[PDB]
Amino acid sequence: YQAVIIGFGKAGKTLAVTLAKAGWRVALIEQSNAMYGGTCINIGCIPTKTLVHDAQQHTDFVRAIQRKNEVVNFLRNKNFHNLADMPNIDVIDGQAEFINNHSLRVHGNLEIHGEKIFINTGAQTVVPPIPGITTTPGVYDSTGLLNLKELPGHLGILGGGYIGVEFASMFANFGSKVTILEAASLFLPREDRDIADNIATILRDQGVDIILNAHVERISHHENQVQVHSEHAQLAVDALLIASGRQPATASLHPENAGIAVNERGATVVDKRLHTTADNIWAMGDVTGGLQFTYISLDDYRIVRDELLGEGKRSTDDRKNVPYSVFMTPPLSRVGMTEEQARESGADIQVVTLPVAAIPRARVMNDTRGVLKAIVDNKTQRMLGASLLCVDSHEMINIVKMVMDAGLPYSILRDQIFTHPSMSESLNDLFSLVK
Amino acid sequence: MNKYQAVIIGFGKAGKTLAVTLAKAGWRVALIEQSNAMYGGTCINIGCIPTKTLVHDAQQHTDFVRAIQRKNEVVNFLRNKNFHNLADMPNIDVIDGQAEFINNHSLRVHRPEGNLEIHGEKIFINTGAQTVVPPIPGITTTPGVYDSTGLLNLKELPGHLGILGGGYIGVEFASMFANFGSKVTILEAASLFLPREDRDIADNIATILRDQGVDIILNAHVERISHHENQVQVHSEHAQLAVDALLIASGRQPATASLHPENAGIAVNERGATVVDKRLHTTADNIWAMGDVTGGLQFTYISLDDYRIVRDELLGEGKRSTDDRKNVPYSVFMTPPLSRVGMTEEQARESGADIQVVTLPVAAIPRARVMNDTRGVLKAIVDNKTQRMLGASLLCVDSHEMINIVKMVMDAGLPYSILRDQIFTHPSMSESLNDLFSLVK
Numbered sequence: 001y002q003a004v005i006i007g008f009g010k011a012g013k014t015l016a017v018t019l020a021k022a023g024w025r026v027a028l029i030e031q032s033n034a035m036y037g038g039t040c041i042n043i044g045c046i047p048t049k050t051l052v053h054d055a056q057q058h059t060d061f062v063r064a065i066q067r068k069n070e071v072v073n074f075l076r077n078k079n080f081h082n083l084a085d086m087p088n089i090d091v092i093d094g095q096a097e098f099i100n101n102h103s104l105r106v107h108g109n110l111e112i113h114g115e116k117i118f119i120n121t122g123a124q125t126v127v128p129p130i131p132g133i134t135t136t137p138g139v140y141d142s143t144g145l146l147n148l149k150e151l152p153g154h155l156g157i158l159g160g161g162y163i164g165v166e167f168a169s170m171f172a173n174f175g176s177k178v179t180i181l182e183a184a185s186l187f188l189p190r191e192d193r194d195i196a197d198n199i200a201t202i203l204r205d206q207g208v209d210i211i212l213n214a215h216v217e218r219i220s221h222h223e224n225q226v227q228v229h230s231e232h233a234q235l236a237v238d239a240l241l242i243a244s245g246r247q248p249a250t251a252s253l254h255p256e257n258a259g260i261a262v263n264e265r266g267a268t269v270v271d272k273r274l275h276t277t278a279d280n281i282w283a284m285g286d287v288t289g290g291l292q293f294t295y296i297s298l299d300d301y302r303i304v305r306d307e308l309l310g311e312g313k314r315s316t317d318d319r320k321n322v323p324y325s326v327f328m329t330p331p332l333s334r335v336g337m338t339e340e341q342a343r344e345s346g347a348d349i350q351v352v353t354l355p356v357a358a359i360p361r362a363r364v365m366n367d368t369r370g371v372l373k374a375i376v377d378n379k380t381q382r383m384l385g386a387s388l389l390c391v392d393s394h395e396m397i398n399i400v401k402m403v404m405d406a407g408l409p410y411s412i413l414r415d416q417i418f419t420h421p422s423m424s425e426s427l428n429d430l431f432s433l434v435k
Numbered sequence: 436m437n438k439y440q441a442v443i444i445g446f447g448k449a450g451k452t453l454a455v456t457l458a459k460a461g462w463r464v465a466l467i468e469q470s471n472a473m474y475g476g477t478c479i480n481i482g483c484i485p486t487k488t489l490v491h492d493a494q495q496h497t498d499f500v501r502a503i504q505r506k507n508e509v510v511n512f513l514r515n516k517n518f519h520n521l522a523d524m525p526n527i528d529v530i531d532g533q534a535e536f537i538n539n540h541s542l543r544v545h546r547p548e549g550n551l552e553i554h555g556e557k558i559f560i561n562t563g564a565q566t567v568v569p570p571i572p573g574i575t576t577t578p579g580v581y582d583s584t585g586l587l588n589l590k591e592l593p594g595h596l597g598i599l600g601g602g603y604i605g606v607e608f609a610s611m612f613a614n615f616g617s618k619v620t621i622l623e624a625a626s627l628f629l630p631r632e633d634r635d636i637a638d639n640i641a642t643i644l645r646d647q648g649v650d651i652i653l654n655a656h657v658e659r660i661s662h663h664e665n666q667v668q669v670h671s672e673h674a675q676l677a678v679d680a681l682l683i684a685s686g687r688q689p690a691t692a693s694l695h696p697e698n699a700g701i702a703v704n705e706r707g708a709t710v711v712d713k714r715l716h717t718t719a720d721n722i723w724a725m726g727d728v729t730g731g732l733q734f735t736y737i738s739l740d741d742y743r744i745v746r747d748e749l750l751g752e753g754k755r756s757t758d759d760r761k762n763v764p765y766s767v768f769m770t771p772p773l774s775r776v777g778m779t780e781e782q783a784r785e786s787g788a789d790i791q792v793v794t795l796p797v798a799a800i801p802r803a804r805v806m807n808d809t810r811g812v813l814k815a816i817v818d819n820k821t822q823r824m825l826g827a828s829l830l831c832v833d834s835h836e837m838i839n840i841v842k843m844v845m846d847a848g849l850p851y852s853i854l855r856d857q858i859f860t861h862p863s864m865s866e867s868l869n870d871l872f873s874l875v876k
């Protein structure tokens with residue numbers, strides 16, 4: 001095996017198939033012999049957004065859980081066939097250890113060797129040191145909450161991140177009271193001045209309870225309900241989700257035996273081109289420690305592929321204007337800088353917003369909530385950011401990002417002919433407010 | 436009354452946008468609309484808004500009457516909204532009544548409570564199109580015959596719907612009432628279904644319609660429309676057909692016969708369309724024409740581009756024209772929608788260029804499995820000599836949003852690899868364009 005990929009991650013999934021067609025003889029290793037395709041397929045966005053779509057429709061929660069199951073099972077088998085149908089790939093099953101820079105121990109047991117090694121072990125949930133989180137019924141993480149038999153009446157969230165907002169909106173539409181608990185003073189502290197307030201009013205109208213400055217010190221199960229204690233105060237919920245955040249999973253590999261350095265939270269430090277301390281080993285995706293997304297992982301594969309099979313090289317520092325989306329209802333999609341970030345630099349700017357009641361396509365789809373906010377730099381007529389909170393905003397931001405990356409001025413989306421009726425054509429109105 | 440610096444005939448898209456634009460500059464604007472139920476124009480009351488609203492409810496399998504009631508309140512909101520966008524500015528006179536030309540300058544507005552006469556330094560024609568009624572005996576007398584207008588006000592869903600003709604507007608109602616739970620029968624008078632799209636595309640979309648119980652009878656021109664036994668009866672050269680409701684979907688041609696443009700010097704053609712410039716002038720001076728009356732594309736976005744052309748001339752930034760148009764996109768809002776831009780594979784194969792045709796089935800789009808609609812296709816055409824793309828055929832859910840990403844790369848002339856290497860948003864419909872252009876070999 002010249003190429004050995006540890007993990008069925010997005011970058012590794014794509015790297016293995018690409019190398020086999022280039023004449024390489026690849027072996028990918030994976031621990032979860034029942035959940036292929038990586039976290040994106042089984043645990044991540046695919047199962048989350050499959051239920052999110054069901055929630056907006058107000059469908060039975062249990063039947064929607066089964067519909068996720070057939071969807072996850074359909075894509076899991078396909079992801080395994082993409083790697084097994086290829087001849088030069090063997091999908092060995094089992095967890096992996098590092099014996100040496102070129103040798104791997106994998107679980108009865110196997111000794112697989114390789115000239116090149118590529119790690120895609122990803123990240124995993126990091127639950128805080130709270131007394132009671134160890135042994136308490138009703139406490140679930142992102143994985144365990146997706147397999148819930150019944151729909152709770154009151155679901156509490158431990159975290160105010162973007163993952164906690166997705167589940168808060170998801171269960172609110174299902175019919176459950178949701179309580180979000182983040183220890184911060186500001187809801188969504190990395191968001192704009194008024195965007196977070198708009199998201200707040202959208203959540204609170206659906207019964208969501210945003211508790212700020214919260215501190216949790218004990219978790220028990222008093223009389224059929226989970227208890228969240230906050231110094232002479234208790235919250236009774238039927239199920240508790242932890243939205244703590246994920247950190248790279250590079251502990252069961254023993255990276256010391258291969259001379260691979262990791263940082264303070266376990267992320268294998270990498271070169272601008274994803275080279276690690278070991279000269280012939282790469283690391284793509286969440287183990288890098290960069291943005292924790294499926295497209296950042298795929299773009300890591302494009303970086304390692306341009307090295308192995310391509311002329312010259314592209315690095316990670318050409319990654320400009322990386323977009324992200326919070327798949328609540330309606331979804332928030334962001335790219336570029338915020339209003340706080342735009343003014344933080346000594347370049348004057350223009351910021352006007354467009355209400356969603358002014359988009360006729362929003363009335364067609366029966367959801368007229370949110371705001372369309374974009375930032376234009378009057379010194380070069382270029383766009384420095386946009387925050388679109390409306391229907392299909394995840395589709396919309398791709399137009400906004402592609403124009404920024406090309407360096408084009410705002411006047412293109414102001415005069416471009418979009419289809420009708422659509423949400424992307426709102427940019428005709430959104431950028432006509434620029435003077 | 437006094438002379439107006441600009442008068443607009445019709446509450447259409449270009450006319451309504453121009454009225455608020457000229458009044459903002461201080462012009463004396465007058466917009467004449469012949470019906471109170473047409474404030475905001477065709478798109479608000481009869482076109483996109485009330486049709487797209489029922490398609491959204493149809494895809495969710497909502498009750499029919501519950502959707503019709505929701506449709507009415509959407510148009511009644513936006514209609515009242517569009518009346519007040521214009522009737523609230525002191526420089527806009529929202530005059531009701533049918534407008535008839537008397538001169539290059541004067542204009543008769545037919546008010547049933549006494550006629551009025553309005554003069555204008557500049558006149559802007561914008562009266563849109565009216566539905567074409569094919570010359571077939573029995574259409575205007577049989578009670579179960581509906582235009583696109585009268586079908587959107589139905590009381591409850593019919594058990595069998597008959598679409599007279601194909602076309603985009605025809606197929607639009609075919610997927611809506613079928614999804615509402617009703618057998619639909621599209622009777623196109625042609626040898627091929629959707630004759631101006633590719634066959635592979637047209638076959639896929641006929642399979643999506645047939646699986647919902649919609650039979651496409653071709654090579655059929657009707658002779659007599661009767662009402663034998665409680666159903667509209669349609670007579671052809673082969674087996675006759677019966678429907679609980681017949682929908683005519685033959686097209687719309689410009690409304691100009693009531694304007695009488697002969698008295699002002701404005702020229703018309705045989706179908707009745709105002710002859711226009713590249714800057715939308717007519718044969719008469721200080722008189723323009725905007726929208727479907729010009730005989731051009733009958734899209735709301737083209738009508739608004741018409742506004743950009745006349746706004747550039749009037750309010751002054753040099754001048755632009757209809758020659759600026761290229762790669763105009765369009766969508767056919769069925770379920771899933773068919774969005775198109777650029778050339779078809781036929782014209783590609785006919786051009787003789789060095790060409791690559793790439794195809795990605797929607798069943799390979801993970802976002803389609805998330806939205807529970809894996810039907811349709813994704814097709815594109817690139818040129819091997821220039822790395823540009825000639826056209827695109829996206830048949831999938833939310834294709835009306837991705838067709839704009841494609842059109843933006845084509846008008847900038849950037850190579851196909853722009854969409855191949857691009858950090859999209861996950862999970863989305865647009866990210867599967869990464870995998871569509873990775874197929875080029």
Ligand SMILES: Cc1cc2nc3c(=O)[nH]c(=O)nc-3n(C[C@H](O)[C@H](O)[C@H](O)COP(=O)(O)OP(=O)(O)OC[C@H]3O[C@@H](n4cnc5c(N)ncnc54)[C@H](O)[C@@H]3O)c2cc1C
Binds near residue numbers: 011
């Ligand atoms: C609830 C949730 C929602 C999310 N929503 C989104 C979203 O909307 N958008 C977005 O862009 N991202 C989202 N993500 C993140 C996304 O799932 C990942 O960031 C993305 O899949 C990156 O994966 P990766 O390339 O790092 O490899 P991963 O797919 O993370 O790799 C994990 C795989 O490697 C295997 N593995 C792990 N350790 C070992 C080992 N030692 N030996 C062998 N195999 C091993 C695991 O069994 C698993 O199959 C979400 C994540 C979660 C948990």
Ligand SMILES: Cc1cc2nc3c(=O)[nH]c(=O)nc-3n(C[C@H](O)[C@H](O)[C@H](O)COP(=O)(O)OP(=O)(O)OC[C@H]3O[C@@H](n4cnc5c(N)ncnc54)[C@H](O)[C@@H]3O)c2cc1C
Binds near residue numbers: 482483534694
């Ligand atoms: C069923 C259907 C679906 C459609 N779907 C789409 C779609 O998905 N996308 C898209 O882009 N377009 C679509 N269209 C087309 C779009 O709705 C219109 O064609 C577009 O608004 C162009 O209108 P206009 O600007 O020319 O003026 P219009 O709004 O068409 O007409 C202007 C107004 O002038 C008035 N008028 C007429 N005669 C006179 C007179 N003598 N005096 C005074 N006033 C008069 C009429 O009341 C009319 O409302 C659709 C049309 C229909 C019928």
Ligand SMILES: [Cl-]
Binds near residue numbers: 760761762
């Ligand atoms: Cl064209």
